[PDB]
Paper text:
Peptides destined for display are first delivered into the endoplasmic reticulum (ER) by the transporter associated with antigen processing (TAP). TAP is a heteromeric ATP-binding cassette (ABC) transporter comprising two subunits, TAP1 and TAP2. Each subunit has an N-terminal transmembrane domain (TMD0) that interacts with other components of the larger peptide-loading complex, a six-transmembrane helical domain (TMD) that forms the translocation pathway, and a nucleotide-binding domain (NBD) that hydrolyzes ATP. In this study, we analyzed the structure of TAP in the presence and absence of peptides. These structures show that TAP suspends peptides across its transmembrane cavity, anchoring their termini in two distal binding pockets primarily through their backbone atoms.
We created an 8-mer modified b27 peptide (b27′) lacking the central lysine at position five, and two 7-mer modified b27 peptides, each lacking the lysine as well as the adjacent glutamine (b27″) or serine [b27″(Q)]. The 8-mer B27′ increased the ATPase activity of TAP to a slightly greater extend compared to b27. Structural analysis revealed that the N and C termini of b27′ bind to TAP using the same interactions as b27. Because the peptide is shorter than b27 by 2 Å, it induces a minor contraction of the translocation pathway. Intriguingly, the arrangement of the TM helices is more similar to the a2- and c4-bound structures than the b27-bound structure. Consequently, the lateral opening seen in the b27-bound structure is no longer present, and the ER luminal gate is entirely closed. NBD separation is greatest in the apo structure (53 Å), and reduced in the presence of peptides to between 35 Å (for the 14-mer peptide) and 27 Å (for the 8-mer peptide). The shortest distance we observed between the N- and C-binding pockets was 25 Å in the 8-mer peptide-bound structure. This suggests that a minimum of eight residues is required for a fully extended peptide to be effectively engaged by both binding pockets and initiate high-affinity binding and subsequent transport into the ER lumen.
Author numbering:
A (entry chain C): 1 to 8
B (entry chain A): 182 to 270, 291 to 483, 492 to 742
C (entry chain B): 131 to 479, 483 to 680
């Protein structure tokens, strides 16, 4: 598993 | 206990990282082979190694994740079940967030360590840039992160406070309209909104500063290694293919370390919030016949809130079979406490007691709870069906004919049949399915279905209707088999106490009257005061 | 759809008062995306410089452009986030204030029929989702939709066939991401449903704790909770297995494009067309493009949920109240006569009130008694203009009560409920509630007149001490005393007391039956016993909603 997220 | 799978998961993660490492090293060496003008055998072998190593890595990663799951879920379920069992005698979000963050931290930590290891496989000089710029990558963003987190949590707390105030006004709305003070509540909301607006500018400044620091540190490192590697390639000690590998290595290492910085405070918060939950975590003889009788000998009890101060003393009543005992007077006499002690809710603080020739803890807990069932202070109906609500706590499920017979004995059979689908009707939670008298009848039926040895039913008909009280008194006076199981009437209706064989009364933590009801009236004690009232 | 279009138009109209922040953030966004697109091409330029003959001028120029574009892309990305989160907070605060202001003025029946948690979810959690549309999701969608086209310009600028490979590769990734996101959303819905079921189980178990402990049924409830937890764990395992399988197939397809792209690029290398730095830059661009496509798809998926939340919130502020406008009547002098005539009231959910007719006087103490299923309070509720009578009308000084000023009527006609409610403030605030600014001397004068100063003078700073939330720190006698003090401090003309002899001491009744503001003011008292019959000047009765 890989981390993924969005920034403002 | 799960280490036998956790060690396998860890070695699976390590091997998956090694296999995943195949893309940049092999593509750099392959471009170096292009510059070397070698034969196609090396190119084909390197492509095959690429594909095989990374497909093994992907399969190994999937297997390791599937092994970490089905195990962490089991641990979470067991922990939540144990916590619920402990509180019986709020967490799941903490548990699965902690699991997710812990596994992400482990994955990216192993990935970064593997990255650095294969850096050290290559030229040591290009690694030196990473090993000096790592403390600058770690210390400063960790400094800014706590500031940003503090401002964010302050903003969230203020938002929660404002929403709480608004919902309080919304709940109190009829009074607000009575006083015509809508604009006052609007101003009160607006002031808190102004405070939130004041804090948010600092929050935005902290967010911008944190983003600036992280981006500038990472991509300054990315340009620094490129400059150093260009200088060394000019020096000739390092092939250009190694530089090609090192560029992608820096991108992957920067992503891994940024994930680590974004993840670690969440892990710290999760373990900090889980430590308090971990702190919050903290045989008898079986009768085989009728109990017959139970008695106490000047027993004393104390409230759990103040165990140093006794609640009552002088319990000498004996549950004679074929007879009905009585208890009435002030509520401070411990009549509810005496009822709880009769149900073996707590050990007595003094004196002695017996039940079927043995103390209450001597008898088995299941047998004691099945033979000394009693109606509560207020009737309560569970959210299950009535056929299920009238059989709560049964060790084995009996036939529905027995349930119907018990409901007819308590008179609740007609009320149950009035509901659709008979006694199998779903009952609303907290006794919302029917009236309070119906709930009291259901409680009486549940008590009767257990076939108790010593009924301690009380405080049911006192809070119920007059017709329900009359039906309960008629059922109590019409108990078959020479009244069969004895009773202890501690209700507020003194009219039903006329049939008591050995009546009694208590006042101020001790007994004050007893004997026949006519003798109690002819006395000069608390019973005489109640009779004259 | 048209509803989504008008909802997004309303969201833009709400975001309109923050135009300068929007344009500044957009400008910084473009400045960030330009440098972020431009950097890897210069990296390939650096590699190409190193591959051939050594040119110190070209190397120095390339490194300088690295430093400049790096500082520009690092600086321009940070300011955009700060501006966008400031815009987020401004939108959230504005929508919270507007929603509360529109919720305040609605009728009482709307709050009667709607649970408090339903309003709390809209006001607290959903107002966060108001500000996720333009500041965050639209920004991320725009930056993805511009950087994808920029990266596709560059790759074409590198070599066309390698771009045709990407064009062939993308649709499978798009379809896989769509399918995975739909399944993940469905499983998340199932997860929260099962979590709610487990919460209901534990709430039911803890609600009847005394009953369960008496019956000894803790083991059965523990087993039921274990069953619910097993269901939740199985659902969690299904979700995580699906996610891991999606990741595995994604990486497999990633190499399935990567290896063949490397092979074709090296064939072009050996043909003598491309160089090493160009191939490296193409590799970086390929690594970025897929991730940008997936995050674009995910954000466009989140769009619809945010729009649905917007519709859910705007349904409240679009709810039309059913109360007539006030006539703004406010006479300087009021006799205080109140007359009922053949009135009828119906609850929104049944003739609860029917055919009531009476007339009150200033100097006459009037009492109304009668159980009628404890529905006697509806007379006072109708008198306070809280509800609109279905038939007849209620008149003050031969004038309907609707035409009176909303502030003046409730500053003139004051009633006290059966259960007094406090507002978690100071005693100074909770006694002079409903008043903008009045002297404190009258406040503790009324407090002394209401037999409430006993627990006030014993507490620090007198009336400025703090009480518990909803008044829960104090007891019922203090509730009645505070309610009487609040009613007296406003100096009313028509005073209504409920359960005076049922929930309050006779000292309060004696004070409210002999006060200077109660000697000659119109008083209507409701009691559940005959204790007020002996002192009432006139007594009226009602049963089953009729006289």
């Amino acid at each position: 598993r890989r981390y993924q997220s969005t920034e403002l | 206990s799960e280490t036998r799978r956790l060690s396998l998961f860890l070695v699976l993660v390590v091997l998956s990282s090694l296999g995943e490492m195949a893309i940049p090293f092999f593509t750099g060496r392959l471009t170096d082979w292009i510059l070397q003008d070698g034969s196609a055998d090396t190119f084909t072998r390197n492509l095959t190694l690429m594909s095989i190593l990374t497909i093994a890595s992907a399969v190994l990663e999937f297997v390791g994740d599937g092994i970490y799951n089905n195990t962490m879920g089991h641990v979470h379920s067991h922990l939540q079940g144990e916590v619920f069992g402990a509180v019986l005698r709020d967490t799941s979000t903490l548990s699965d967030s902690l699991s997710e963050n812990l596994s992400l931290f482990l994955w990216y930590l192993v990935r970064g360590l593997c990255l650095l290891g294969i850096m050290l496989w290559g030229s040591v000089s290009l690694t030196m840039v990473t090993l000096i710029t790592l403390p600058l990558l770690f210390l400063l963003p960790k400094k800014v992160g706590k500031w940003y987190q503090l401002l964010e949590v302050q903003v969230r707390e203020s938002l929660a406070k404002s929403s709480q105030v608004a919902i309080e006004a919304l709940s109190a709305m009829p009074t607000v309209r009575s006083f015509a003070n809508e604009e006052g509540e609007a101003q009160k909301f607006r002031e808190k909104l102004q405070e939130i607006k004041t804090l948010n500018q600092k929050e935005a400044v902290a967010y911008a500063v944190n983003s600036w620091t992280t981006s500038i540190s990472g991509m300054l490192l990315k340009v620094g290694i490129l400059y150093i590697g260009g200088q060394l390639v000019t020096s000739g000690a390092v092939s250009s293919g190694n530089l090609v590998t090192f560029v992608l290595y820096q991108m992957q290492f920067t992503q891994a370390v940024e994930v680590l910085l974004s993840i670690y405070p969440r892990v710290q918060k999760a373990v900090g919030s889980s430590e308090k939950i971990f702190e919050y975590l903290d045989g008898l003889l079986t009768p085989l016949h009728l109990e017959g009788l139970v008695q106490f000998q000047d027993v004393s009890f104390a409230y759990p809130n103040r165990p140093d101060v006794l609640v009552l003393q002088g319990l000498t009543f004996t549950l004679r079979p074929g007879e009905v005992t009585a208890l009435v007077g002030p509520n401070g006499s411990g009549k509810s406490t005496v009822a709880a002690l009769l149900q073996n809710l707590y050990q007595p603080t003094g004196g002695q007691l017996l039940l079927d020739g043995k103390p209450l803890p001597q008898y088995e807990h299941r047998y004691l709870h099945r033979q000394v069932a009693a109606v509560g202070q207020e009737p309560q109906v569970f959210g299950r069906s009535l056929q299920e609500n009238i059989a709560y706590g049964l060790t084995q499920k009996p036939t529905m004919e027995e349930i119907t017979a018990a409901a007819v004995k308590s008179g609740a059979h007609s009320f149950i049949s009035g509901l659709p689908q008979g006694y199998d009707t779903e009952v609303d939670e907290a006794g919302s399915q029917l009236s309070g008298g119906q709930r009291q009848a259901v409680a009486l039926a549940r008590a009767l279905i257990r076939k108790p040895c010593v009924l301690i039913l009380d405080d049911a008909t006192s809070a119920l209707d007059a017709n329900s009280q009359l039906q309960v008194e008629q059922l109590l006076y019409e108990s078959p088999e020479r009244y069969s199981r004895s009773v202890l009437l501690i209700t507020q209706h003194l009219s039903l106490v006329e049939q008591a064989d050995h009546i009694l009364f208590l006042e101020g933590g001790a007994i004050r009257e007893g004997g026949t009801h006519q003798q109690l009236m002819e006395k000069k004690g608390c019973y005489w005061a109640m009779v004259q009232a | 759809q048209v509803n989504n279009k008008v909802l997004m138009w309303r969201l833009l109209k709400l975001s309109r008062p923050d135009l300068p922040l929007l344009v500044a953030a957009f400008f910084f966004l473009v400045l960030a995306v330009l440098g972020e697109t431009l950097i890897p091409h210069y990296s390939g330029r650096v590699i190409d410089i190193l591959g051939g003959d050594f040119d110190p001028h070209a190397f120095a120029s390339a490194i300088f452009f690295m430093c400049l574009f790096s500082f520009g892309s690092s600086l321009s990305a940070g300011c955009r986030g700060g501006c966008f989160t400031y815009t987020m907070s401004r939108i959230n605060l504005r929508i919270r204030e507007q929603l509360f202001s529109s919720l305040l003025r609605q009728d009482l029946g709307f709050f009667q029929e709607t649970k408090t948690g339903e309003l709390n979810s809209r006001l607290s959690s959903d107002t966060t989702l108001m500000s996720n549309w333009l500041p965050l999701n639209a920004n991320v969608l725009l930056r993805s939709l511009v950087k994808v086209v920029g990266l596709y310009g560059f790759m074409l600028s590198i070599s066309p066939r390698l771009t045709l490979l990407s064009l062939l590769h993308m649709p499978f990734t798009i379809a896989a991401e769509k399918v995975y996101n739909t399944r993940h959303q469905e499983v998340l819905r199932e997860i929260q449903d099962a979590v709610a079921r487990a919460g209901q189980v534990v709430r039911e178990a803890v609600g009847g704790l005394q009953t369960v402990r008496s019956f000894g049924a803790e083991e059965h409830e523990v087993c039921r909770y274990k069953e619910a937890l097993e269901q939740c764990r199985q659902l969690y395992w299904r979700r995580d297995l699906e996610r891991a399988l999606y990741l595995l197939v994604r990486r497999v397809l990633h190499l399935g494009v990567q290896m063949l792209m490397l092979s074709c690029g090296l064939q072009q290398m050996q043909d003598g067309e491309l160089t090493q730095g160009s191939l490296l830059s193409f590799m970086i661009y390929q690594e970025s493009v897929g991730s940008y496509v997936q995050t674009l798809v995910y954000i466009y998926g989140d769009m619809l949920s945010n729009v649905g939340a917007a519709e859910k919130v705007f349904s409240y502020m679009d709810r039309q109240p059913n109360l007539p406008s006030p006539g703004t009547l406010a006479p300087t002098t009021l006799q205080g006569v109140v007359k009922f005539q053949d009135v009828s009231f119906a609850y929104p959910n049944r003739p609860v009130l029917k055919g009531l007719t009476f007339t009150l006087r200033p100097g006459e103490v009037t009492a109304l008694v009668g159980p009628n299923g404890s529905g006697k309070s509806t007379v006072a509720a109708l008198l306070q203009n809280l509800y609109q009578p279905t038939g007849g009308q209620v008149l003050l000084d031969e004038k309907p009560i609707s035409q009176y000023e909303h502030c003046y009527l409730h500053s003139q006609v004051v009633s006290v409920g059966q259960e007094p409610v406090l507002f978690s403030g100071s005693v100074r605030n909770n006694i002079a509630y409903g008043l903008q600014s009045c002297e404190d001397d009258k406040v503790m004068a009324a407090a002394q007149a209401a037999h409430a100063d006993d627990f006030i003078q014993e507490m620090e700073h007198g009336i400025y001490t703090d009480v518990g939330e909803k008044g829960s720190q104090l007891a019922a006698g203090q509730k009645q005393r505070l309610a009487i003090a609040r009613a007296l401090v406003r100096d009313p003309r028509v005073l209504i007391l409920d359960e005076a002899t049922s929930a309050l001491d006779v000292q309060c009744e004696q004070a409210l039956q002999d006060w200077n503001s109660r000697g000659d003011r119109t008083v209507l008292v409701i009691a559940h016993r005959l204790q007020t019959v002996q002192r009432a000047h006139q007594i009226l009765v009602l049963q089953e909603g009729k006289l």
